[PDB]
């Protein structure tokens, strides 16, 4: 039997599934460490690797990209977990190696591949404390081209009144996602600052791991793909909505939590986002 991880229920994804919308024909690039395409609870539609020494995007030598991918799009069947957008067209864009790191140019190359291949949504469960002009130009280009771009806020916790949101999350064009637990409390590691946009579940998140395994991970990395999957659900119900409209639908319908410095606009609610008329619950 299949299990529905709590975070998928928490953002109200089953309400979209029951309306008949599961992310069909929406192209989501997971820009990450690869995705294990042999996992029976994933279907990978395509991809490319920008990692010079690891040329196969369908081999995930870290595990992280496979876990993130399962939160976006684990298949709806009788096994494993269920993804937020289980019918989405999933693309493995490998820009991080086995050790979980990549050069800025590899990330930029992956973003460029996503634009050239007409991705609808990019998820980036990755970050660093500094930006670059070239990084900012790549994300701004993707957004100008129509792509919904979602990233982890970072796991830097608090630092007084300073923002601790990393890049590319920190760029205005990117939706930066923080992490809450099942009681809607901010995870202590979740980055903070006025650049924090929305929150999603990021504590003890069950998903797919390489070699036909499953496990619970923690991180803003786990929160980001709930939002990238929610964007795919919204586009499957409203295929002509722009990235501008998908982003506002998510921002305008959150359940507000605490102060925006710590919680941004609150927890996403994909049921409310996918309605025509939007308000907070």
């Amino acid at each position: 039997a299949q299990s529905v991880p709590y975070g998928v229920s928490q953002i109200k994804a089953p309400a979209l599934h029951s309306q008949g919308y599961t992310g069909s024909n929406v192209k989501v690039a997971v820009i990450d460490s690869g995705i294990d395409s042999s996992h029976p609870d994933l279907k990978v539609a395509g991809g490319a690797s920008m990692v010079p020494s690891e040329t196969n995007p369908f081999q995930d030598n870290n595990s992280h990209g496979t876990h993130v991918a399962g939160t976006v799009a684990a298949l709806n069947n009788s096994i494993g977990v269920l993804g937020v957008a289980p019918s989405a067209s999933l693309y493995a864009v490998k820009v991080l190696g086995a050790d979980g790191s990549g050069q800025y140019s590899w990330i930029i190359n992956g973003i460029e591949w996503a634009i050239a291949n007409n991705m609808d949504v990019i998820n980036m469960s990755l970050g660093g404390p500094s930006g670059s002009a070239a990084l900012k130009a790549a994300v701004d280009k993707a957004v100008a081209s129509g792509v919904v771009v979602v990233a982890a806020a970072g796991n830097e916790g608090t630092s007084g009144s300073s923002s601790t949101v990393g890049y590319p999350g920190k760029y205005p064009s990117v939706i930066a996602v923080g992490a809450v637990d099942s009681s809607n409390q901010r995870a202590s590691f979740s980055s903070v600052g006025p650049e924090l946009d929305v929150m999603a579940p990021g504590v003890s998140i069950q998903s797919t791991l390489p070699g036909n395994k499953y496990g619970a991970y923690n991180g803003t990395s786990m929160a980001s793909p709930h939002v990238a999957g929610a964007a795919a659900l919204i586009l499957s119900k409203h295929p002509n909505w722009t990235n501008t409209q998908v982003r506002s639908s998510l921002e305008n319908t959150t359940t507000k939590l605490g102060d925006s410095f710590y919680y941004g606009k609150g927890l996403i609610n994909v049921q409310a986002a996918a309605q025509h008329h939007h308000h907070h619950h």
Binding site: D32, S33, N62, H64, H67, V95, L96, D99, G100, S101, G102, Q103, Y104, I107, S125, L126, G127, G128, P129, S130, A152, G154, N155, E156, Y167, A187, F189, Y217, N218, G219, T220, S221, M222, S224
Partner: protein, 63 residues
């Protein structure tokens, strides 16, 4: 103890030694400063970001 600001500007060797005294089961990975990395949170992990001289370039923290 989850951050080591006193280690910035020290050698990667001294930083490893000090972190392992405070956290003997730490999984330490050395990475170049100015890379982008995965954003999962691993309580056992300490990433050390080094400059091209192999000195610590950013405050080490658990995660």
């Amino acid at each position: 103890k989850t951050e080591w600001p006193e280690l910035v500007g020290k050698s990667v060797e001294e930083a490893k030694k000090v972190i392992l005294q405070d956290k003997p089961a730490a999984q330490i990975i050395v990475l170049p400063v100015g890379t982008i990395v995965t954003k999962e949170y691993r309580i056992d992990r300490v990433r050390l970001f080094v400059d091209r001289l192999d000195n610590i370039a950013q405050v080490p923290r658990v995660g």
